């Protein structure tokens, strides 16, 4: 099911790809396997010009990291960086500060992106 969405995603059938991945999510036996699905599924909403809708799936992917005693996986690293970026536009600097510090154990480019954002939110905190 995951493969079908990628084909649909690569062919500009985004309206169909949403339902395809949603079918994939039920078939997965373990929640941890859904971490990759959540991030890309959220991206498909972003290109459907509705940022509010993608927040709900964005909450779930990061929350999986907490539910897995801090798995600290790569596809949550891009999740936390994007979530903190949007929260700055929302004006909630305090709610964006904890996101940057929690992702401070990623890649070289990931940590610097959050560290600079951590300084940005701590300025207005």
């Amino acid at each position: 099911w995951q493969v079908l969405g990628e084909c649909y995603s690569k062919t500009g059938n985004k309206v169909e790809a949403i339902k395809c991945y949603k079918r994939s999510i039920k078939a997965s036996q373990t929640v941890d396997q859904n971490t990759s699905i959540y991030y890309r599924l959220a991206q498909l909403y972003e290109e459907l010009e509705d940022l509010q809708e993608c927040k709900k799936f964005m909450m779930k992917c990061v929350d999986v990291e907490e539910l897995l005693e801090g798995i600290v996986t790569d596809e949550t690293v891009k999740a936390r960086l994007w979530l903190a970026i949007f929260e700055i536009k929302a004006g909630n600097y305090q709610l964006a500060y904890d996101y940057a510090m929690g992702v401070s154990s990623g890649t070289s480019q990931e940590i610097e992106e959050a560290r600079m954002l951590a300084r940005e939110c701590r300025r207005h905190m």
Partner: protein, 57 residues
């Protein structure tokens, strides 16, 4: 080169001064002001007046 460096730094952090990151921005601000406002009776070798234009820009 120092003029080229000064415009280089100013452009990279363009629009980064409207702060009411501020600590390092304030530190960079006061460091630049030290460069532009320092008066030396004896010319130091590694802080000449050639860097004055770059600091202002």
């Amino acid at each position: 080169y120092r003029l080229a460096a000064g415009i280089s730094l100013g452009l990279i952090n363009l629009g980064a001064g409207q702060t009411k990151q501020n600590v390092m921005y304030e530190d960079l601000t006061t460091k630049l002001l030290e460069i532009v406002t320092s008066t030396y009776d004896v010319e130091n070798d590694w802080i000449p007046e050639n860097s004055q234009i770059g600091a202002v820009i």
